[PDB]
Ligand binder design. Structure first.
Ligand SMILES: [Zn+2]
Ligand SMILES: [Zn+2]
Lengths: 105, 56, 122, 119
């Protein structure tokens, strides 16, 4: 579009940044795109905020183990995500509202 | 001699305490350095001097 | 144990393989000290250009410029999680993380002259 | 001392006197920032230091086997369980005063029978 321009963060879209263990990501790659690559689900538990990640049964044969997430602060920093398409257009997609680390299990 | 060895052991024994006594005195900050010497330098001098007085 | 409680769990679409910018989702990070505010009438415009490659970010002239440099990697990696209107989450791997990386400015008509004065010092 | 930085630059602050209202400020030499001073003290030398004596007193201090123990009753919790060391300020002059760290209340007491401390 306008060349060399950046796109639209003004919309204030929020996204989460999550640190994942290398092994888990490796597993995720396995999921088929055709499937839509549903890796598993995220659980939000109350009685305090607890968030965990569990792999889909298809991913591994065993009992799915929950991976606890440690919520973290934004830190004194502003993190924004920008994307570059094949077209090489650049867009300012969203701001990182929350940070989290998925612990290995 | 058997008793000379008892007498020697008890010479070192008393010097060993005399040293602990100056150490306890130095740890309690009551030690008063000799003009032109560290509080520590002054202490080590005493320790070294007692221990030699003893060996002799 | 038994779950007397309720959990809200969302399906996670492990990263869709085919995305237009599947290839590039990047992180642009600014230090809080820089005090960059995206909601600025001034910062309405913004251009991002590769410097020939650090990225160069610039607003309209008269505004600060930032340089973006790439951070080192690790065993763990970051994914961007976005949520669809339907609760489902889609995750995308971060291609690269850049620390920006801007100007000041007040660096014109100086630098080279100051060093020279400093030399007039020794 | 304890000095501040410029919000906006993060660059350090240089003192400027406001000749008119007879007051001290802190200017930034990279931008147009100025802020009034908290204290009148700008520079402190300190030749006869005491900062270094009780350094590296991590709560894990008890986990050092190299450290010696004593049956001295604590001024706070009265516990006869404590590790001890000498002034960690690695100077020649330095006194052989001992610092005892409680294996319960974590309070630092000394053997100094000349003076009374709080560090
Ligand atoms: Zn400044
Ligand atoms: Zn105590």
């Amino acid at each position: 579009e306008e060349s060399l321009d950046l796109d639209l963060e003004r919309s204030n879209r929020q996204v989460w940044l999550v640190r994942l263990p290398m092994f888990l990501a490796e597993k995720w790659r396995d999921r088929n795109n055709l499937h839509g690559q549903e890796l598993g689900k995220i659980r939000i538990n109350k009685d305090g905020s607890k968030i965990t990640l569990l792999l889909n049964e298809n991913d591994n044969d065993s009992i799915p183990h929950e991976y606890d997430l440690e919520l973290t602060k934004k830190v004194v920093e502003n993190e924004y995500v920008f994307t570059e398409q094949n077209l090489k257009k650049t867009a300012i997609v969203g701001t990182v509202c929350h940070e989290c680390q998925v612990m290995p299990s | 001699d058997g008793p000379t060895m008892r007498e020697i052991t008890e010479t070192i024994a008393e010097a060993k305490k005399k040293v602990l006594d100056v150490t306890k005195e130095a740890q309690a900050n009551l030690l008063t350095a000799k003009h032109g010497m560290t509080l520590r330098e002054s202490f080590e001098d005493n320790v070294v001097r007692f221990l030699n007085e003893a060996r002799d | 144990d038994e779950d007397p409680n309720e959990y809200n769990e969302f399906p996670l679409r492990a990263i869709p393989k085919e995305d237009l910018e599947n290839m590039r989702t990047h992180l642009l990070k600014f230090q809080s000290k820089k005090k960059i505010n995206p909601v600025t009438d001034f910062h309405l415009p913004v251009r991002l250009h590769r410097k020939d490659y650090p990225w160069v970010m610039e607003d309209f002239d008269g505004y600060n410029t930032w340089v973006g440099s790439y951070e080192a990697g690790n065993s763990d990696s970051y994914v961007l999680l976005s949520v669809e209107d339907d609760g489902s989450f889609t995750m995308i791997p971060a291609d690269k993380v850049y620390k920006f990386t801007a100007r000041n400015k007040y660096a014109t008509l100086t630098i080279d002259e100051a060093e020279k004065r400093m030399d007039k010092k020794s | 001392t304890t000095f501040r930085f410029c919000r906006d630059c993060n660059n350090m602050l240089y003192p400027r006197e406001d000749k008119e209202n007879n007051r001290l400020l802190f200017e930034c030499r990279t931008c147009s920032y100025v802020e009034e001073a908290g204290s009148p003290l700008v520079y402190r030398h300190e030749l006869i230091t005491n900062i270094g004596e009780t350094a590296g007193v991590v709560q894990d201090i008890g986990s050092d086997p190299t450290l010696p123990r004593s049956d001295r009753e604590c001024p706070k919790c009265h516990s006869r369980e404590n590790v001890f060391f000498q002034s960690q300020q690695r100077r020649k002059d330095t006194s052989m005063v001992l610092f005892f760290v409680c294996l319960s209340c974590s309070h630092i007491f000394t053997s100094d029978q000349k003076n009374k401390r709080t560090q």
